[PDB]
Amino acid sequence: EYDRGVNTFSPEGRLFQVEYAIEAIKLGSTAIGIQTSEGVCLAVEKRITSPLMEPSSIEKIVEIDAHIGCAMSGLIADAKTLIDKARVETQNHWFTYNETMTVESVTQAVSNLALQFGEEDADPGAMSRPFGVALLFGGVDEKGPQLFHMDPSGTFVQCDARAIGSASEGAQSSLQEVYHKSMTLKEAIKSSLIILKQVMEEKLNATNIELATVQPGQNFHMFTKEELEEVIKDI
């Protein structure tokens, strides 16, 4: 009956809304993120509902900045507000300090906004519920290619490889088996597609899969359908 307030601790000790929002991520499409010395690879399942929908309209992978990209799972609409915060913050950092923001700094800022929800909050319009989106931020900074995980809880952790989505648990076991520190970006892109193909209900095709990569040499690039076809043909 929604008797409990939004900020209520469970008898166990975990906030009820945050736990329910983590359950929402499980409904979301699987996204595979792998960090390799050559580059960081982000892949996602478009899950087009019908032939009529134009495929390009779905945008799970978005560019926070030239060096930083994020892949999202869970409610896409909630993510848009978080993505906008990241884009504005990176641009503010450029104006104030004339330098690229580190990926960790960007993930921390979006992570800070995650738990800022209150029923009795002073602002007339304020977030009433936890964000229901999980974000994987992948970018190359001075430290090197880096990948980070953001959860509705607001915990941010650097990840060598991770899967966010309905099949995250199954994909994570597969990712752990295929992940090597010395893997090249091309090997990572192939491995990410293989794990995604197994988890995805639909057969893998260029239209149903969105893949993007950031490498130290090049700015964030999203694979074109022709580029996606060559990698998938190798399978």
Partner: peptide
């Protein structure tokens, strides 16, 4: 002009 450049960059991303 620097503030215009920031606004233009955010416009391109959005």
């Amino acid at each position: 002009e620097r503030l215009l450049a920031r606004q233009c960059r955010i416009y391109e991303l959005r």
